[PDB]
């Protein structure tokens, strides 16, 4: 407690054994035989483990280009050039840079934004995800990819992921939306 808030602080835990996910939180209704991705701590983004990544073998085979899509995002924009400069053993070389290479700063990133206030709040006030998607893309170039919604609606702080909802999916004023964004 910090009364001088406890479970309100956001955690992400790397797990060595995916079965230990059941110990991370209370009132999960734990089972030993649910796969990690179904468990409440993973659905909330409070837990992670290596076992969710091993399908990247088969995705790297079936579409190489799609693995570069993930990495551009997940590394924040590492490149074969940067990987080679590090493999040259000299350490990460840097300094002041030209306007020509600084053009790479204007690139897309993943961001998370709230429907509680600002121009998009009109959709949190009883609109639908399809309305929000089209409006944000048209007015801002903001491309919505999913929701981060409170698990319970009334008292806990936990939220869960909803990848790419249907167009008629109802929104809440407390929702946050994951967005691809350019500034």
């Amino acid at each position: 407690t910090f009364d001088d808030a406890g479970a309100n602080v956001p955690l992400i835990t790397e797990l060595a054994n995916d079965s230990n996910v059941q110990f991370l939180d209370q009132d999960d209704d734990d089972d030993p035989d649910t796969e990690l991705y179904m468990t409440q701590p993973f659905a909330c983004g409070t837990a992670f483990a290596v076992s969710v990544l091993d399908s990247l073998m088969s995705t790297s085979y079936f579409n190489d280009n799609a693995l570069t899509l993930i990495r551009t995002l997940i590394t924040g924009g590492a490149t074969p050039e940067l990987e080679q400069i590090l493999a040259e053993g000299a350490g990460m070389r840097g300094g002041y840079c030209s306007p020509a290479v600084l053009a790479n700063r204007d690139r897309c990133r993943v961001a998370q934004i709230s429907l509680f206030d600002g121009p998009l709040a009109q959709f949190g006030q009883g609109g639908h995800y399809g309305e929000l998607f089209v409006y944000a893309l048209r007015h801002f170039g903001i491309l919505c990819i999913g929701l981060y919604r409170f698990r319970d609606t009334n008292p806990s702080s936990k939220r869960y992921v909803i990848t790419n909802p249907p167009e008629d999916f109802p929104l809440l004023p407390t929702d946050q939306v994951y967005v691809l964004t350019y500034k």
Binding site: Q22, D30, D31, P32
Partner: protein, 213 residues
């Protein structure tokens, strides 16, 4: 998808391999003995039934060999020699591996049946004849007031014979289950939702007390 586990796969393979080879070899001997030998114009023959051949092969592959029934054609005898060299190896390896698989079964599975108005205490951690005997002789001691509390041991192991004797001496008020408090399914079996307390005993004589803690 029904044959789910490696031991059930091995079990069904052993049993059905044995039975199919035994039934096949019994038919083969039945053909040879009832045929009679071709070298003697089929005059040397025996009128065995298939069931007598099936019995005789069991009696020979087990190496009992009563000789109440035996082969008398030269083909049936040379078949019995080939059969002896092969099937003694099968019987002497298969029957112990069947007995091993049937022996490797949990004897303290199942679930605590909560009696209508009695209390129970779950006990776990370092459970052994030394820890349990010292615990029970203080917990169930006659100088305490008479209270009906059941003790429910939960441990990931089979009791040693000394502990199994001690559990049987307290059969009316002590119960034991295979399992671990690390599994929600085992905690449900011991009915811990409505236990009065859980006691976690420690190995005071472990090689390192931080791994034990």
């Amino acid at each position: 998808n029904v044959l789910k586990t490696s031991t059930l796969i091995r079990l069904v393979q052993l049993v059905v391999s044995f039975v199919s080879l035994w039934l096949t070899a019994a038919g083969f001997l039945h053909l040879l003995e009832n045929s009679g030998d071709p070298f003697f114009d089929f005059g040397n023959a025996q009128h065995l039934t298939y069931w007598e051949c099936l019995y005789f092969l069991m009696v020979t592959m087990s190496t009992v060999g009563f000789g109440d029934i035996f082969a008398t054609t030269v083909l049936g005898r040379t078949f019995v020699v080939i059969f002896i060299m092969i099937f003694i190896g099968l019987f002497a390896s298969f029957i112990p591996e069947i007995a091993e698989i049937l022996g490797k079964r949990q004897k303290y599975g199942g679930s605590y049946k909560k009696e209508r108005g009695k209390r129970h205490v779950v006990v776990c951690g370092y459970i052994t004849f030394d820890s349990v005997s010292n615990f029970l002789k203080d917990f169930l001691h006659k100088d305490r007031e008479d209270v009906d509390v059941e003790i429910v041991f939960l441990h990931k192991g089979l009791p040693g014979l000394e502990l199994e004797g001690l559990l049987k001496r307290h059969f009316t008020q002590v119960e034991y289950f295979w399992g671990s408090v690390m599994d929600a399914n085992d905690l449900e079996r011991v009915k811990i939702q409505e236990a009065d307390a859980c006691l976690v005993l420690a190995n005071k004589y472990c090689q390192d007390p931080d791994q034990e803690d």
